[PDB]
Amino acid sequence: VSQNDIIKALASPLINDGMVVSDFADHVITREQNAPTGLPVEPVGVAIPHTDSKYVRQNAISVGILAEPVNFEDAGGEPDPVPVRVVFMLALGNWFDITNVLWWIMDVIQDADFMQQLLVMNDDEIYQSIYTRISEAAGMAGIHFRRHYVRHLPL
Amino acid sequence: VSQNDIIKALASPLINDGMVVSDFADHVITREQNAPTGLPVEPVGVAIPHTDSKYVRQNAISVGILAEPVNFEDAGEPDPVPVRVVFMLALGNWFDITNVLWWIMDVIQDADFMQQLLVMNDDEIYQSIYTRISEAAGMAGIHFRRHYVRHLPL
DSSP states (O other): OHHHHHHHHHHHHHHHHHHHHTHHHHHHHHHHHHHHOEEOSSSSSSEEEOOGGGBOOOEEEEEEEEEEEEOOTTTTTOOOOEEEEEEEEEEOHHHHHHHHHHHHHHHHHTTTHHHHHTTTHHHHHHHHHHHHHHHTTTGGTTTOOOGGGGEEEEO | OHHHHHHHHHHHHHTTTTTTTTTTHHHHHHHHHSOOOOOOOSSSSHHHHHOOOBOOOOOOOOEEEEEEEEEEOOOOOOEEEEEEEEEEEEOSSSHHHHHHHHHHHHHTOHHHHHTTTSSHHHHHHHHHHHHHHOOOOOTTBBBBOOHHHEEOOO
């Protein structure tokens, strides 16, 4: 899988559900190229690909679990790429939403045991687990997260 | 005074200090166009203009207080936000972005502090913001200097 392949696969449910505009994936791709979203966290690399809120209709997150790592560029410019296994595609409507969701994500990904679990669980289990955590966070109110917003790649 | 004027004025000290690349202001302006940073908060309108980290050399914040309101569009609402306080951000990665946004969204809910910013002097604003930044562990590594505060026009 390439980065663009992943972005398109994860954008699909959001486009289909009307959460974002028809060309959302193209914009995430261009945004990714200018502003990489590889997060060099251990032991499971994460990416948070997204674009601008003008392409978002309702707030949503689409999750991809990658069987093999896929390199994303480090958001901070370091030459070592990020070996991404977990991808949180973000579709957010304003900077208040962006702030609340970034804070939640940066916290969740510090849970090493949780992040290892994401790599062995099936889609039902991953959906249950993330949904549950989303539901306990006031800051995540108003974010759509449906069972078809989780998938393993390749599909 | 338009946005670009504010953006160029706040970019100047960061450019001079080497905190950002020479053409930082133009990249902030182009990103403002597609991802506007007006924050419709009460009692004072705020903006958080910034651009991508490739244009950033070191983490910094540049603060502007405006005598009259300058409109920044609202990313959410068709009407623009009448902004009186501007936090220009120069941040190098998503951990930095997260920590600084978290801090900013908290600060601007404090109505008293935000009212004080509209009458305090450059020295008093600098000391207040410097205290509030330093008292925050998540705000470590962010450069904030006396000349990163200004009233516009200047």
